Symmetry: C2
Subunit: 111 residues, 2 copies
Protein backbone atom coordinates (compact mmCIF):
# COMPACT_ATOMS: atom_id res chain seq x y z
CA UNK A 1 0.00 0.00 0.00
CA UNK A 2 1.61 3.20 -1.26
CA UNK A 3 -0.01 6.64 -1.32
CA UNK A 4 0.31 9.00 -4.29
CA UNK A 5 1.07 12.55 -3.19
CA UNK A 6 -2.99 12.07 -0.59
CA UNK A 7 -4.42 11.79 -4.11
CA UNK A 8 -4.60 8.00 -4.48
CA UNK A 9 -3.39 4.62 -3.15
CA UNK A 10 -1.68 1.63 -4.83
CA UNK A 11 -1.29 -1.97 -3.66
CA UNK A 12 2.43 -2.45 -4.30
CA UNK A 13 4.59 -3.98 -1.56
CA UNK A 14 6.76 -1.11 -0.21
CA UNK A 15 9.47 -3.63 0.67
CA UNK A 16 10.14 -4.48 -2.98
CA UNK A 17 12.31 -1.35 -2.85
CA UNK A 18 15.50 -0.82 -0.82
CA UNK A 19 15.46 1.35 1.14
CA UNK A 20 11.68 0.98 1.46
CA UNK A 21 9.32 3.32 -0.37
CA UNK A 22 7.15 5.70 1.66
CA UNK A 23 5.17 7.31 -1.20
CA UNK A 24 4.73 7.71 -4.96
CA UNK A 25 5.05 10.89 -7.05
CA UNK A 26 3.82 11.50 -10.63
CA UNK A 27 6.71 12.46 -12.93
CA UNK A 28 6.31 15.43 -15.31
CA UNK A 29 8.49 15.96 -18.38
CA UNK A 30 11.43 14.18 -20.01
CA UNK A 31 14.44 15.67 -18.15
CA UNK A 32 15.44 12.22 -16.86
CA UNK A 33 14.67 10.08 -19.92
CA UNK A 34 18.21 8.78 -20.51
CA UNK A 35 17.98 6.56 -17.40
CA UNK A 36 14.41 5.49 -18.10
CA UNK A 37 12.32 7.90 -15.97
CA UNK A 38 9.60 9.15 -18.36
CA UNK A 39 6.72 11.66 -18.34
CA UNK A 40 3.74 10.00 -16.64
CA UNK A 41 5.78 7.46 -14.65
CA UNK A 42 5.15 6.99 -10.89
CA UNK A 43 8.40 7.48 -8.90
CA UNK A 44 8.82 5.43 -5.67
CA UNK A 45 10.44 7.59 -2.98
CA UNK A 46 12.12 6.88 0.38
CA UNK A 47 11.63 9.86 2.70
CA UNK A 48 15.01 11.07 4.02
CA UNK A 49 17.41 14.01 3.97
CA UNK A 50 20.60 11.95 3.86
CA UNK A 51 21.69 11.60 0.24
CA UNK A 52 24.92 11.89 -1.76
CA UNK A 53 26.29 13.05 -5.13
CA UNK A 54 25.24 10.83 -8.04
CA UNK A 55 21.93 9.71 -6.55
CA UNK A 56 18.55 10.71 -8.03
CA UNK A 57 16.72 12.92 -5.52
CA UNK A 58 13.46 14.78 -5.00
CA UNK A 59 14.13 18.41 -4.11
CA UNK A 60 11.97 21.40 -3.30
CA UNK A 61 13.24 24.77 -4.49
CA UNK A 62 10.98 27.43 -2.97
CA UNK A 63 7.54 25.84 -3.39
CA UNK A 64 8.50 23.73 -6.41
CA UNK A 65 9.49 20.05 -6.58
CA UNK A 66 11.89 18.50 -9.11
CA UNK A 67 13.58 15.12 -9.73
CA UNK A 68 17.28 15.33 -10.68
CA UNK A 69 20.77 13.88 -10.07
CA UNK A 70 22.63 15.60 -7.19
CA UNK A 71 26.08 17.26 -7.29
CA UNK A 72 26.68 19.38 -4.18
CA UNK A 73 29.82 21.16 -2.95
CA UNK A 74 29.25 23.27 0.15
CA UNK A 75 26.86 26.14 -0.56
CA UNK A 76 26.84 25.30 -4.28
CA UNK A 77 24.10 22.86 -5.33
CA UNK A 78 23.78 21.56 -8.90
CA UNK A 79 20.74 19.50 -9.95
CA UNK A 80 21.64 17.69 -13.18
CA UNK A 81 19.38 16.16 -15.88
CA UNK A 82 19.76 12.94 -17.88
CA UNK A 83 18.84 14.50 -21.26
CA UNK A 84 21.27 16.53 -23.38
CA UNK A 85 18.52 19.05 -24.30
CA UNK A 86 18.04 20.23 -20.69
CA UNK A 87 20.07 22.85 -18.79
CA UNK A 88 21.47 22.04 -15.33
CA UNK A 89 19.90 23.91 -12.39
CA UNK A 90 22.19 25.79 -9.99
CA UNK A 91 21.12 26.80 -6.49
CA UNK A 92 22.82 28.85 -3.76
CA UNK A 93 21.82 27.78 -0.25
CA UNK A 94 22.46 31.30 1.06
CA UNK A 95 19.80 32.87 -1.17
CA UNK A 96 16.91 30.49 -1.83
CA UNK A 97 15.20 27.81 0.24
CA UNK A 98 16.37 24.31 -0.66
CA UNK A 99 15.14 21.04 0.84
CA UNK A 100 15.75 17.36 0.11
CA UNK A 101 12.43 15.50 0.26
CA UNK A 102 13.73 12.01 -0.44
CA UNK A 103 15.67 9.43 -2.46
CA UNK A 104 14.33 7.76 -5.61
CA UNK A 105 14.26 3.98 -5.10
CA UNK A 106 12.08 2.76 -7.97
CA UNK A 107 9.55 3.32 -10.74
CA UNK A 108 6.09 1.99 -11.67
CA UNK A 109 4.76 2.53 -15.25
CA UNK A 110 1.18 1.54 -16.14
CA UNK A 111 -0.02 3.99 -18.80
Amino acid sequence: GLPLVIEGHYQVDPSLFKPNADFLLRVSGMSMKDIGIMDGDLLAVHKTQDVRNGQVVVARIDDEVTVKRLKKQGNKVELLPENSEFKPIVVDLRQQSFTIEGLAVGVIRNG
Copy 2:
Protein backbone atom coordinates in the same frame (compact mmCIF):
# COMPACT_ATOMS: atom_id res chain seq x y z
CA UNK B 1 0.27 -29.05 4.32
CA UNK B 2 3.81 -29.36 2.94
CA UNK B 3 5.11 -31.28 -0.06
CA UNK B 4 8.11 -33.57 0.39
CA UNK B 5 11.06 -33.19 -1.99
CA UNK B 6 9.88 -36.06 -4.21
CA UNK B 7 6.22 -34.95 -4.18
CA UNK B 8 7.36 -31.48 -5.28
CA UNK B 9 9.29 -32.94 -8.24
CA UNK B 10 6.24 -34.91 -9.37
CA UNK B 11 4.00 -31.81 -8.98
CA UNK B 12 6.51 -29.63 -10.89
CA UNK B 13 6.64 -32.13 -13.79
CA UNK B 14 2.82 -32.18 -14.02
CA UNK B 15 2.64 -28.37 -14.16
CA UNK B 16 5.47 -28.12 -16.74
CA UNK B 17 3.82 -30.72 -19.02
CA UNK B 18 0.53 -28.79 -18.97
CA UNK B 19 2.34 -25.48 -19.59
CA UNK B 20 4.10 -27.00 -22.64
CA UNK B 21 1.34 -29.21 -24.07
CA UNK B 22 -1.76 -28.24 -22.10
CA UNK B 23 -1.97 -31.93 -21.24
CA UNK B 24 -0.78 -33.80 -18.11
CA UNK B 25 1.83 -36.60 -18.22
CA UNK B 26 1.01 -40.31 -18.07
CA UNK B 27 2.06 -42.44 -15.08
CA UNK B 28 4.68 -44.09 -17.33
CA UNK B 29 6.14 -40.75 -18.39
CA UNK B 30 6.46 -39.72 -14.72
CA UNK B 31 8.25 -42.94 -13.70
CA UNK B 32 10.62 -42.71 -16.68
CA UNK B 33 11.56 -39.05 -16.19
CA UNK B 34 12.08 -39.40 -12.44
CA UNK B 35 13.62 -42.88 -12.58
CA UNK B 36 11.00 -44.63 -10.45
CA UNK B 37 11.00 -48.44 -10.35
CA UNK B 38 7.59 -48.61 -12.07
CA UNK B 39 4.27 -46.84 -12.85
CA UNK B 40 2.90 -48.14 -9.50
CA UNK B 41 5.53 -46.02 -7.75
CA UNK B 42 4.33 -42.91 -9.59
CA UNK B 43 0.71 -43.62 -8.64
CA UNK B 44 1.61 -43.54 -4.94
CA UNK B 45 3.02 -40.02 -5.14
CA UNK B 46 -0.03 -38.90 -7.13
CA UNK B 47 -2.32 -40.22 -4.39
CA UNK B 48 -0.47 -38.09 -1.83
CA UNK B 49 -0.77 -34.97 -4.02
CA UNK B 50 -4.53 -35.47 -4.44
CA UNK B 51 -4.84 -36.03 -0.71
CA UNK B 52 -3.07 -32.71 -0.14
CA UNK B 53 -5.45 -31.00 -2.56
CA UNK B 54 -3.08 -29.79 -5.27
CA UNK B 55 -4.53 -32.14 -7.91
CA UNK B 56 -7.63 -34.21 -8.69
CA UNK B 57 -7.53 -37.77 -10.08
CA UNK B 58 -10.35 -38.90 -12.37
CA UNK B 59 -10.80 -42.56 -13.31
CA UNK B 60 -11.32 -43.18 -17.01
CA UNK B 61 -9.49 -41.95 -20.10
CA UNK B 62 -5.69 -41.76 -20.07
CA UNK B 63 -4.00 -38.60 -18.73
CA UNK B 64 -6.76 -37.97 -16.21
CA UNK B 65 -5.00 -35.49 -13.92
CA UNK B 66 -6.32 -31.99 -13.16
CA UNK B 67 -4.78 -29.06 -11.24
CA UNK B 68 -6.70 -27.44 -8.36
CA UNK B 69 -6.38 -24.11 -6.52
CA UNK B 70 -4.78 -22.41 -9.52
CA UNK B 71 -5.72 -18.81 -8.65
CA UNK B 72 -2.89 -17.00 -6.86
CA UNK B 73 -2.71 -13.47 -5.43
CA UNK B 74 -0.07 -11.19 -6.98
CA UNK B 75 2.44 -11.99 -9.75
CA UNK B 76 5.17 -14.64 -10.29
CA UNK B 77 8.58 -13.45 -11.54
CA UNK B 78 10.20 -15.21 -14.52
CA UNK B 79 13.99 -15.11 -14.82
CA UNK B 80 16.30 -16.67 -17.43
CA UNK B 81 14.50 -19.16 -19.74
CA UNK B 82 16.09 -22.47 -20.77
CA UNK B 83 15.96 -24.16 -24.16
CA UNK B 84 13.26 -26.84 -24.61
CA UNK B 85 11.26 -25.54 -21.62
CA UNK B 86 8.01 -23.53 -21.58
CA UNK B 87 8.21 -19.89 -20.44
CA UNK B 88 6.39 -20.62 -17.17
CA UNK B 89 8.40 -23.77 -16.33
CA UNK B 90 8.81 -24.01 -12.53
CA UNK B 91 12.62 -23.81 -12.75
CA UNK B 92 12.26 -20.28 -14.22
CA UNK B 93 10.15 -18.87 -11.37
CA UNK B 94 12.24 -16.91 -8.88
CA UNK B 95 9.46 -15.73 -6.57
CA UNK B 96 6.02 -14.11 -6.20
CA UNK B 97 5.43 -10.35 -5.89
CA UNK B 98 2.46 -8.75 -4.14
CA UNK B 99 1.47 -6.30 -6.86
CA UNK B 100 -2.13 -5.55 -7.96
CA UNK B 101 -2.53 -7.13 -11.42
CA UNK B 102 -5.35 -4.70 -12.27
CA UNK B 103 -3.04 -1.68 -12.14
CA UNK B 104 -2.15 -2.65 -15.73
CA UNK B 105 -4.42 -2.82 -18.79
CA UNK B 106 -5.00 -5.49 -19.98
CA UNK B 107 -4.29 -7.13 -16.59
CA UNK B 108 -0.81 -8.57 -15.93
CA UNK B 109 -0.31 -12.34 -15.61
CA UNK B 110 3.40 -12.36 -14.71
CA UNK B 111 6.60 -10.28 -14.53
CA UNK B 112 9.68 -10.98 -16.72
CA UNK B 113 13.24 -9.72 -15.99
CA UNK B 114 14.51 -7.71 -18.98
CA UNK B 115 17.98 -8.46 -20.38
CA UNK B 116 19.94 -5.72 -22.11
CA UNK B 117 19.32 -2.16 -23.31
CA UNK B 118 17.59 -2.83 -26.68
CA UNK B 119 14.46 -0.89 -25.67
CA UNK B 120 15.98 1.94 -23.64
CA UNK B 121 14.63 4.76 -25.83
CA UNK B 122 11.11 4.07 -24.51
CA UNK B 123 12.32 3.58 -20.93
CA UNK B 124 12.67 -0.20 -20.67
CA UNK B 125 16.13 -0.80 -19.15
CA UNK B 126 18.33 -3.82 -18.38
CA UNK B 127 17.08 -5.38 -15.12
CA UNK B 128 13.55 -3.92 -15.22
CA UNK B 129 10.61 -6.20 -14.38
CA UNK B 130 8.27 -6.19 -17.39
CA UNK B 131 4.55 -6.71 -16.70
CA UNK B 132 3.14 -9.14 -19.32
CA UNK B 133 -0.42 -10.17 -20.35
CA UNK B 134 -0.31 -13.76 -21.68
CA UNK B 135 -1.79 -13.89 -25.19
CA UNK B 136 -1.10 -14.74 -28.84
CA UNK B 137 -3.43 -12.06 -30.19
CA UNK B 138 -1.09 -9.14 -30.94
CA UNK B 139 -0.85 -6.52 -33.70
CA UNK B 140 1.84 -4.77 -35.76
CA UNK B 141 3.45 -1.92 -33.86
CA UNK B 142 2.86 -3.30 -30.35
CA UNK B 143 5.70 -4.17 -27.92
CA UNK B 144 5.65 -7.97 -27.49
CA UNK B 145 7.44 -10.86 -25.77
CA UNK B 146 8.50 -13.45 -28.39
CA UNK B 147 10.59 -16.59 -28.68
CA UNK B 148 12.96 -17.31 -31.60
CA UNK B 149 14.30 -20.89 -31.53
CA UNK B 150 13.58 -20.69 -27.80
CA UNK B 151 15.59 -17.46 -27.16
CA UNK B 152 13.16 -14.96 -25.52
CA UNK B 153 13.21 -11.24 -26.47
CA UNK B 154 11.20 -7.98 -25.97
CA UNK B 155 10.75 -5.97 -29.22
CA UNK B 156 8.23 -4.09 -31.42
CA UNK B 157 6.34 -6.29 -33.93
CA UNK B 158 6.55 -5.91 -37.75
CA UNK B 159 5.19 -8.88 -39.77
CA UNK B 160 6.82 -9.36 -43.18
CA UNK B 161 5.22 -12.22 -45.14
CA UNK B 162 7.09 -15.48 -44.48
CA UNK B 163 9.45 -13.45 -42.25
CA UNK B 164 9.00 -11.39 -39.06
CA UNK B 165 11.08 -8.36 -38.09
CA UNK B 166 11.47 -7.47 -34.38
CA UNK B 167 12.42 -3.78 -33.96
CA UNK B 168 14.60 -2.20 -31.20
CA UNK B 169 14.37 1.26 -29.58
CA UNK B 170 18.13 2.03 -29.25
CA UNK B 171 20.40 3.53 -31.95
CA UNK B 172 23.19 0.98 -31.27
CA UNK B 173 20.89 -1.93 -32.25
CA UNK B 174 19.38 -3.29 -35.50
CA UNK B 175 16.25 -5.43 -36.16
CA UNK B 176 16.16 -9.20 -35.56
CA UNK B 177 15.00 -10.89 -38.79
CA UNK B 178 13.21 -14.22 -38.37
CA UNK B 179 12.70 -16.61 -41.31
CA UNK B 180 9.62 -18.70 -40.51
CA UNK B 181 10.69 -21.28 -43.10
CA UNK B 182 13.67 -22.38 -41.00
CA UNK B 183 13.27 -21.02 -37.45
CA UNK B 184 10.75 -21.70 -34.69
CA UNK B 185 8.76 -18.63 -33.60
CA UNK B 186 6.03 -17.95 -31.04
CA UNK B 187 4.36 -14.96 -29.38
CA UNK B 188 4.31 -15.29 -25.58
CA UNK B 189 2.45 -12.11 -24.66
CA UNK B 190 1.88 -8.34 -24.68
CA UNK B 191 3.91 -5.84 -22.60
CA UNK B 192 1.58 -3.76 -20.38
CA UNK B 193 3.88 -2.07 -17.85
CA UNK B 194 7.15 -1.92 -15.90
CA UNK B 195 8.34 -2.15 -12.28
CA UNK B 196 11.94 -1.01 -11.60
CA UNK B 197 13.48 -1.78 -8.19
